[PDB]
Design a protein around this ligand. Structure first.
Ligand code: HEC
Ligand code: HEC
Ligand code: HEC
Ligand code: HEC
Ligand SMILES: [Ca+2]
Ligand SMILES: [Ca+2]
Ligand code: NA
Ligand code: NA
Lengths: 125, 354, 376, 125, 376, 355
């Protein structure tokens, strides 16, 4: 609730903005509009582009590479809005930038933003 | 034990007596000094290899044997994609089924038949003893058993830590023992956020325990013909290499022109690239991917020829969803990718980088 | 006790611990069922709008569907498809208008039809469910037009094409009863039966005047197509029930949702979808509260529940929230859905005890319309 | 603030939902987005249709007929939202009904609802 | 003390009492002036968005403009027109994408040009004012394209036509310095100068790399076209000032917004439009608060005002609200505009003393970008 | 004085001695028993009136003089709209400017000149007494003064309460003395919520003190030529009635075909309707407005002939913005408007409302 304080990850609620994997999420958690943590809601199109972050997992003390992928071709969901910025760099380091609509590669050239999934893509560093 | 079995395959592997003229062994083409690939120049450069007979050329580039032991046995998964197997077209199920084919392939080792392979195994007293200790007395007197035991010993040898040592810089960085240079780390980041990690990673998500930079799947990335390699193979200018569709049993035309996703381990030291050796430089291999994304004149051009890439040898079943990422790799990212790939070279081949 | 975001946290950690792989992809929504509920959000007249597809049992959003300016949602009772009549303009809210009907697969939610309506003929009004209506066979969608005159537009969903406008009397709403027949309510106090071909003047028949000039029939009657029951409250919680199941109108006895003492004390219905009808239970649910006589669109905090045959009160629930719209699942042990336009939340109640069960928050900007499929 | 209470008109602030002339307004007060009490915001188009109401003016004790006209061809303003229904009748008495988008007759066929104006058209009888 | 609503109630009361007639009509917005402020609402990625046109002095909404998906608003410094690069789709957020430029008359707000941009070329991103920019002559709009590679689109507002795409290296943002020239910020830490003749490859010079790998420059630098002053805060509050008045980039002394002390207590810039720059006062305004190093997009409660020349701190303002974006009018005795995405309110402060004068609430869903014209 | 000038106009009004053949007074055409309109049949029915020669027909319908005293003098307001005046094309500034015209008009009362009018006023000893007490001695001896003075007396007379008693049911209902029938109340609501109020109410907003159901503007509602009237008047098959453009001094081609919005007071008893008396029934004048709104075929057909309404006499500068309301009046609303319009009938003409 203190938005300026260091962000404190938890590994117990994926729909909350402090879930560990959402460390550099921007927009809306897909799990809140019929997607899941790592899948898009029906009717939307999964981008192949991502921005990444190394997100600390309180649980195993390990850092994981989370490659956020957008689910596209719908109007923004309006549910579980979240913006975190752990390790988020400015647009000129696009690989780590999260204002960008990461919808590239999405079916049907879908480019509108609906929500963001939080898959692990490897070990950090 | 698996020690002894592997030790027997290690003898067989360097033994030219399993070729017709006794001029060549697995090691002639899969030269351990070159990440188990062929250093020898032919009628088609290093694009394809020359068999025992001194003139027959293959129509495919000799792949590394490093890490081939990590590939699953051939299978179709529940989302309907074939995965695993051996050869560029997955026509062998595994290392065992693969091993014997070079021995009997006329354009390679060219033994007439299994019996001739057995006869040669009987000429060496040390084979009588090694084989018999592992498979029982008179194994070498039965061609079928001999040949199969040979293929098994070869496969075991290729499953030793020697072929898959995971001592590359990439492995050492992921163990926390060292760091990537800024450029390598950029390349790693680019590799995992761009379309590359949709085919050149074991898993779709989560962390792989023994990463070999291939999901083992089959994709037609739309490569043209290697015109000289094709000329040297004498397969004919009519001939189309349909990759996976060539595996017996595969009938589905969606698989025509699809090839197994090579493991990128040691990629820096096993040029030329792709199933046909068409690209001599790693950088070319990477730039090839821009042809689906870049709108710039130069992306249509193969930098090694100065001319257009050429139509695909097989102009259907292109992996367009994956390849048309919508994003073009600039020079910087291509540089960073080269750096990243180079970190996938085994410790013993670090000198080969230069 | 454990929330769905907690269950999902626990299952992701366990997949990570076991190295279980999973391909990221587009989910399919669970099969439509009795406890699926759609909440439409007219977003207080915004040019674009959202419907939320919701699993009422879990209280989980299982899907969404985008719409344009004040779309009319419909949901095939049988669960086979949903559709809406919707309106877009070429420059957000200016320029060329296109009215169109989309039909959607109810699992992938992909549009399986996009049907242009010529000459932008939709009635733009705060969403009345019964201003766009599916025939019982699901093959035809009927939409009201008001301008230049009351008319009803016919859309063939099966051949995916607009068919024709029908000229009708001075009447309102569309309660289909047959593939070629619907009723409207007329300014003169009658119902009109409209029977239409592919061409030719529709057969139009009026019932008698069933209410006085000074008894006001609300804009959100409950109509159960499968029962042919039209439940029409007045401003005072007087309830008109018309049975259209014979294919003509049979006026049922009027019931009062509120007692004389309650009415003496200013109890009146109020809200948006003020009334729901449970087909299987033959039960009427009316949002009521103590209110001045011209506060008839404000939220209400109480649902009275009454036997449709006797008018007997069975319950009076204190909803515990500001409710604008109610609806019920049509299965046994129905859910009573209670949508707060103010809270943007669907409260999901057990319709027997009125207990709040769970709720779905964050449903757009001004959600107003609850639709359930009658599947059983 | 008790939404169910009898509505009490005031003749002292036109942006408040109890301003006397808004006794059957539905939507937004044009004065809150660049119009005024009786004029449309720039870029929007004035409807010629209207629904009416008899609203009591507590300044003079007289009841006036207010014919509300919509300003159309913009997305809803989102400012000074109000809904009042004094004498508001159902849709079938459309001249007294206020869910209808009264944008008819607006220039350029504009039919999107932006806000509503509250001009007097006569005295009540 | 009288509010605008009250003053309006009395004028209307008096017109009615006097029997004064007046024609219902479409108002013109007052002439654009220095205190006109535009608030854009990217609406948290919603498919359609709004621009509020606000009279800064009166704290009154004087008009609105609808936009599509994450549109880029621009405002001619001379007040003669506004424009946006916008994006629509044929079905709310799905289907054929049309990117376009509209130019608007700043008093009728009517569109005067609607210029289609071939091949959906716009960069889609949280709104960065300097991703789409007007050349000083107002004749050309330049918009950033990211896909498939960095590029800049050239739009002729005078002949109302798209012209061509410009190939550029790995660079970002567009800072027009002339009819045929704009700078960008590059991944290798240089600025690129792009000069576009008529035809063929633009001429691209690079500057000196002016910051290391690990000095992070914000997505919303302040840029004063008429000053040629590019003002670029880093995450730490280190502010790069670049002079572009000569045509080529002269790097000004780099300056610091927070103290070396202060940075040690966790004072960091943070928000959206973190920095304002007053042209005539040569002055920098920065939103700062005590925050973790990776909470750089969160709201801030304080503004620091520093001398652009020396780096001296002129004021610290306790804004009294969670502010995400600031900007200032460019007249004498400037207002300091403080936009809270959270409150959806433009708080209008006296820029001299930080006192809150007035505010305009209800500015959409998640307003983010404040634009002002620089008129004298 | 104000009594006496009026009283003198009263006498002039009814005096045939002001026509060449002495057959015709203002009252002949502006008959008090019919709300000051012409009950007589000409060659175009009641569309147009016959002058003193018993032969000549006018090209426009004789309008009521009731409530004409409420019309502002002709002017152009700041929103560039012309407003007020007298005649259908507002070519006279006011009642006094208008009054002399029927007198010298060969199609009407047909006196050859002012002098011939003065000579008439001398032959009557009561006019000598009457005019001299209001205007001075030998006023009748000066043809200019005599003619101005007659015009003045006639204008004063038309401004008496007698011409505008405001005693219709609508007035009684607005003063609270009675209520409308349900049909009239519905008519009333329609009227003030549909496009009629845009033209047939004095003010754009607020409440008028003496409503006469017109905003005094000039509008081309796109009426066709009235062929029989146009044939009777002898103006020719190629003649165009340009409306307000015909006012000397109006050059603006955008004014072509625009006519002054009539007061709808007494509309019920002063058929036929429009400037050329083209429509006989009140209902037909109302149905005409549907041709701009309705999609139905019947909306393009004049119910009184079964033929299309006709091409506009002037096919440009139609009030399309006001006329194309996007909403069609159904028969219920038409009936309601007739009922409402009948409540605008002055008390003494409520007997004619029987028909
Ligand atoms: C040159 C004439 C060769 C000799 C001798 C051997 N191999 Fe080979 N190998 C060669 C080529 C051109 C290819 C690819 C051909 C194709 O059809 O795709 C191969 C392939 C293999 C593989 C599969 C590796 C993979 O798919 O990633 C294995 C495991 C392999 N070869 C092993 C092998 C052994 C054990 C040999 C001695 C018995 C041997 N090879 C000989 C070229 C040549
Ligand atoms: C699936 C659609 C793929 C994507 C996306 C990428 N690669 Fe790939 N790669 C793929 C296949 C099926 C093959 C073999 C192709 C053939 O028919 O011969 C390859 C090959 C390479 C190579 C050559 C390696 C070798 O020959 O041993 C390299 C260096 C390579 N690929 C790299 C690479 C990079 C860096 C990518 C992202 C830009 C990438 N590939 C995408 C399958 C797919
Ligand atoms: C029949 C031959 C008439 C006699 C005699 C008089 N009037 Fe008349 N009047 C007549 C017509 C056909 C018209 C309209 C012609 C046109 O060009 O528009 C009129 C008009 C008036 C008006 C204007 C009323 C209005 O615009 O609403 C007035 C005030 C008027 N007439 C008065 C009038 C008087 C005072 C007369 C005797 C002095 C008189 N009229 C004679 C038809 C005839
Ligand atoms: C301005 C665009 C108008 C609107 C809207 C309506 N009316 Fe009208 N009306 C108008 C004019 C300029 C005229 C005279 C036209 C001409 O050239 O003659 C009229 C006339 C009538 C009449 C006949 C009156 C008479 O001849 O004495 C009636 C009965 C009438 N108008 C009624 C009416 C109604 C009921 C309307 C709403 C449907 C309406 N008018 C709209 C100008 C305009
Ligand atoms: Ca190779
Ligand atoms: Ca008449
Ligand atoms: Na070659
Ligand atoms: Na003229």
């Amino acid at each position: 609730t203190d938005p300026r304080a260091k962000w404190v990850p938890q590994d117990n609620d994926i729909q909350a903005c402090d879930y560990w994997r959402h460390c550099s999420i921007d927009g809306n958690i897909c799990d809140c509009s019929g997607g899941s943590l790592t899948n898009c809601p029906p009717g939307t199109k999964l981008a192949t582009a991502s921005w990444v972050a190394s997100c600390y997992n309180p649980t195993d003390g390990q850092s994981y590479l989370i490659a956020y992928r957008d689910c596209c071709g719908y109007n923004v969901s309006g549910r579980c809005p979240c913006l975190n910025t752990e390790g988020e760099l400015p647009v000129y380091r696009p690989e780590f930038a999260n204002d960008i609509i990461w919808c590239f590669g999405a079916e049907d050239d879908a480019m509108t933003y609906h929500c963001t999934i939080s898959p692990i893509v490897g070990k950090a560093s | 034990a698996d020690d002894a079995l592997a030790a027997l395959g290690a003898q067989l592997f360097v033994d030219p007596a399993l070729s017709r003229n006794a001029t060549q062994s697995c090691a002639t083409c899969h030269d351990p000094a070159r990440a188990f690939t062929d250093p020898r120049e032919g009628k088609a450069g290093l694009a394809v290899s020359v068999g025992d007979d001194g003139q027959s050329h293959g129509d495919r580039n000799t792949p590394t044997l490093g890490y081939a032991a990590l590939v699953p046995a051939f299978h179709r998964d529940a989302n309907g994609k074939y995965k695993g197997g051996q050869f560029w077209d997955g026509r062998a199920d595994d290392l065992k089924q693969q091993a014997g084919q070079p021995m009997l392939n006329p354009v390679e080792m060219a033994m007439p038949d299994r019996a001739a392979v057995a006869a040669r195994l009987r000429d060496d007293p040390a084979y009588r003893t090694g084989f018999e200790a592992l498979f029982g007395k008179g194994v070498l007197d039965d061609p079928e058993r001999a040949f199969d035991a040979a293929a098994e010993a070869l496969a075991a040898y290729q499953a030793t830590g020697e072929f898959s040592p995971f001592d590359s810089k990439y492995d050492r960085v992921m163990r926390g023992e060292e760091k990537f240079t800024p450029l390598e780390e950029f390349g790693y980041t680019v590799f995992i956020t761009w379309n590359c990690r949709l085919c050149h990673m074991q898993r779709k998500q989560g962390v792989a325990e023994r990463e070999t930079f291939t999901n083992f799947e089959y994709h037609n990335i739309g490569l043209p013909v290697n015109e000289t390699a094709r000329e040297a193979s004498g397969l004919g200018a009519d001939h189309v290499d349909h990759g996976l569709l060539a595996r017996p049993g595969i009938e589905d035309p969606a698989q025509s022109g699809r090839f197994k996703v090579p493991s990128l381990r040691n990629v820096a030291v096993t040029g030329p690239y792709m199933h046909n050796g068409v690209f001599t430089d790693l950088r070319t291999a990477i730039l090839f991917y821009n042809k689906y994304t870049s709108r710039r004149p130069e992306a249509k051009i193969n930098p090694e020829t100065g001319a257009p890439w050429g139509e695909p040898e097989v102009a259907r079943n292109l992996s367009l969803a994956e390849l048309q990422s919508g994003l073009m790799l600039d020079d910087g990212r291509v540089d960073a990718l080269v750096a990243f790939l180079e970190t996938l070279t085994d410790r013993r081949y670090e000198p080969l980088l230069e | 006790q454990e929330t769905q975001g907690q269950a999902a946290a626990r299952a992701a950690a366990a997949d990570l611990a076991a190295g279980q792989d999973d391909e990221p992809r587009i989910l399919e929504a669970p099969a439509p069922d009795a406890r699926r509920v759609y909440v439409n959000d007219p977003a207080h007249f915004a040019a674009v709008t959202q419907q939320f597809v919701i699993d009422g049992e879990a209280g989980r959003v299982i899907g969404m569907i985008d719409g344009g300016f004040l779309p009319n949602p419909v949901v095939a009772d049988d669960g086979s498809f949903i559709a809406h009549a919707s309106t877009v303009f070429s420059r957000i809210a200016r320029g060329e208008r296109t009215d169109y009907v989309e039909v959607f697969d109810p699992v992938t939610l992909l549009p399986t039809a996009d049907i242009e309506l010529p000459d932008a003929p939709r009635f733009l009004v705060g969403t009345y469910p019964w201003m766009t209506s599916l025939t019982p066979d699901g093959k035809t969608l009927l939409f009201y037009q008001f301008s230049p005159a009351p008319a009803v537009g016919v859309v063939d969903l099966e051949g995916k094409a607009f068919k024709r406008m029908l000229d009708v009397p001075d009447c309102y709403h569309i309660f289909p009863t047959a593939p070629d027949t619907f009723f409207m309510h007329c300014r003169d106090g009658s119902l009109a039966k409209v029977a239409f071909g592919t061409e030719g003047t529709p057969e139009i028949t009026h019932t008698e005047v069933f209410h006085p000039e000074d008894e006001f029939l609300i804009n959100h009657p409950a109509y159960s197509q499968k029962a042919g029951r039209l439940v029409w409250p007045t401003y005072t919680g007087k309830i008109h029930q018309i049975d259209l199941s014979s294919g003509d109108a049979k006026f049922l006895p009027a019931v009062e949702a509120l007692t004389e003492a309650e009415r003496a004390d200013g109890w009146r219905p109020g809200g948006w979808q003020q009334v729901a009808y449970h087909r299987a239970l033959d039960r009427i649910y009316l949002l009521v509260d103590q209110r001045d006589e011209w506060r008839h669109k404000t939220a209400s905090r109480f649902v009275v529940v009454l036997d449709a045959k006797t008018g007997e009160r069975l319950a009076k629930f204190e909803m515990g929230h500001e409710i604008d719209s109610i609806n019920v699942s049509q299965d046994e042990k129905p859910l009573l859905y209670a949508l707060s336009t103010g809270d943007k939340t669907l409260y999901i109640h057990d319709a027997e005890s009125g207990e709040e069960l769970r709720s779905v928050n964050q449903l757009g900007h001004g959600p107003q319309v609850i639709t359930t499929a009658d599947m059983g």
